[PDB]
Write a protein that binds this ligand. Structure first.
Ligand SMILES: O=c1cc[nH]c(=O)[nH]1
Ligand SMILES: O=c1cc[nH]c(=O)[nH]1
Ligand SMILES: [Zn+2]
Ligand SMILES: [Zn+2]
Ligand SMILES: [Zn+2]
Lengths: 379, 375
């Protein structure tokens, strides 16, 4: 059975161009010590950036801009060495959120075209989620949607939790959700903004990137989806299908708590917001939500499976964000293996559930089957 | 026949309520002319709703109803009898003594803790308590308080929030407080209150009532605070420390794998010696120093909690009286957790008996026929 990675990223070289053109986060800079640039994407990296700008003895800010971000060859090598047959690549955070409304559409258009072209270089092994110019007007976002649905190898949309600027429960965003759903594009929801840095306290710099990445990201996703659900987006756009990064952040773990808090909320109940025919978060989880398996443990994975069903979980690696630190970056990646291992421990090696999670769900849901059969036969 | 114990259950004694009535800023209790019960306004997220109500006498009532259940011991015993609970380990609810001025704090904490002990004396064998600490006072006053509460009949631990002395639980100044409590063999019950900065919920947050702050803010705050403790080495520096985490650890069982992966892949941590081979993993800490309550409302979350800490380290709770039925006996907020246990481990199993009470009996030495706390 085929192995598909649905959570895996690239920054096209032209996108990288923009990042070193930038004076504020997100940005890429080169520092005296290493000829390997620094990728500075997150609010949490700001304090260390200012410290490294005013002090050469201070630690390097952000993360290393490796060749694994921009090189298609590196991507294919990674896939070969980790037993991945197919990747559905996507532009990584922060996408186009920082662009002015007038320029975003044209930049998104070019970058999406680049991804299509990259996928064409290895027919049958590469597909992509397109990024949208969500800092631009809604009409431009719709036009961009119509365009990407007709790009070769596009199998959905990646979007962040800020939406148009006011999150995913913004009613102005409803027509974007409708446009994407009607175009039968899967929506891959992905974190970036995390939580305000103050929540991590005054010693946060001592803990590296662990708190914003281990906690901020999945909590952001949970909050964004909970907001969507509460505003009734899933009911208003019944054909919408969303894939959630990091097994829904914390959603499978908190779904019961969310439900109990809703049914026990005085204000909601007494103002008619909790009717008897109400679709529960569990229903939405079985009907409109898919979860990636980037969860690193059979503990989280089993919760995700129990929440959405084994036919709705999809393997991913988050390549290239977690390289081995002291092991060979050209060898197998622990960050990939940990997830595959979680799958095996949870549902058993060789099982049909394993096959489903590791690739077959993605094949079915993203309609990769005809491409795959062709390739295996004709290629 | 086995004992059902509720370890997550609150009260505000009348004296404590009087203090809240007199306050001008949150936390406060405030009566409105159109309301039968006073309003309990505890959270940052309720601020905006409070101002709107202070001006416009037609805007919605702020905060939550301050029902009699908060102060009534008789209603506590009634809740227990009608929900099949033999034993409650009651605790002062958030925000405890966090808001008290430093000089007044130790005296008030001493009095309130003494009242809790006395309340437990009214129903011998059925009531124990977690004591709260005067954490706004200097650390030596806090230690003196710990030394007092250990001698109190029926006291079986300490409840505290995530702000510590004012800088969170990874604050090195807080370390001797953890040491003293652990040496006294008091279980620390970590509980949320501060939540998340309200901007994270967006401009439509008011429309969803309390759902986001309570369903997400609370457990997320718990996760962040404990993760900070772990990263700061608190669990290694205080090896005898035992902690009970509210709401099954918040999200920790679901995120433990992710935390470990982020650690081992952290370039800065690994390259500065902070990720040695002899590292005690979060998984190890979850099996050795962490207990989880079963206030999780689903067998899905409960199964993840059990897999993380073991069935011998999960404890039933209700969060009484914060989630009363709106329209209507036995509370759903209690029954949902019971049903989660039955569904996860099977009715009448020894796993069910453990989680429903026997773990708490063992860990908290819940035998009122003795004077001491049998470790
Ligand atoms: O997708 C990812 C993963 C880790 N860190 C990021 O900034 N983005
Ligand atoms: O313990 C609790 C539970 C719900 N809401 C609160 O403010 N405190
Ligand atoms: Zn990612
Ligand atoms: Zn062909
Ligand atoms: Zn509580």
């Amino acid at each position: 059975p085929v192995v598909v990675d649905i959570h895996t990223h690239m920054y096209p070289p032209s996108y990288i161009a923009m990042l070193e053109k930038r004076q504020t986060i997100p940005l890429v800079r080169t520092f005296p010590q290493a000829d390997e640039p620094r990728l500075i994407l997150l609010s949490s990296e700001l304090a260390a950036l200012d410290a490294a700008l005013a002090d050469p003895a201070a630690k390097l800010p952000g993360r290393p801009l490796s060749t694994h971000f921009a090189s298609l060859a590196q991507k294919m090598h990674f896939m070969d060495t980790n037993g991945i047959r197919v990747s559905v690549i996507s532009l990584a955070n922060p996408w186009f959120d920082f662009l002015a409304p007038d320029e975003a559409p044209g930049i998104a258009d070019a970058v999406n075209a680049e991804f299509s072209d990259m996928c064409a270089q290895h027919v049958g092994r590469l597909f992509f989620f397109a990024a949208l110019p969500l800092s631009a007007p809604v009409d431009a976002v719709k036009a961009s949607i119509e365009r990407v649905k007709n790009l070769k190898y596009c199998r959905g949309i990646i979007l962040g939790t800020s939406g148009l600027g006011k999150g995913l429960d913004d009613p102005h965003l409803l027509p974007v959700f409708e446009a994407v759903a009607d175009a039968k594009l899967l929506v891959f929801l992905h974190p970036h903004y995390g939580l305000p840095n103050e929540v991590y306290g005054p010693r946060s710099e001592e803990y590296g990137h662990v708190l914003p990445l281990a906690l901020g990201f999945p909590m952001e996703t949970t909050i964004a989806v909970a907001r969507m659900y509460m505003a009734g987006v899933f009911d208003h756009v019944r054909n919408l299908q969303m894939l959630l990064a990091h097994s829904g952040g914390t959603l499978p773990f908190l779904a019961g708590r969310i439900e109990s808090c809703i049914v026990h909320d005085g204000h909601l109940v007494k103002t008619g917001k909790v009717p008897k025919d109400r679709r529960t978060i569990w229903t939405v989880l079985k009907e409109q939500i898919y979860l990636d398996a980037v969860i690193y443990s059979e503990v989280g994975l089993q919760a995700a499976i129990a929440s959405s069903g084994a036919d709705r979980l999809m393997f991913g690696t988050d390549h290239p964000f977690f390289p081995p630190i002291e092991e060979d970056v050209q060898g197998p990646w622990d960050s990939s293996r940990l997830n595959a291992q979680a799958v095996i421990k949870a549902v058993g090696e060789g099982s049909s559930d394993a096959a489903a999670v590791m690739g077959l769900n993605a094949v079915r849901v993203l309609s990769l089957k005809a491409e795959l059969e062709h390739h295996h036969h004709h290629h």
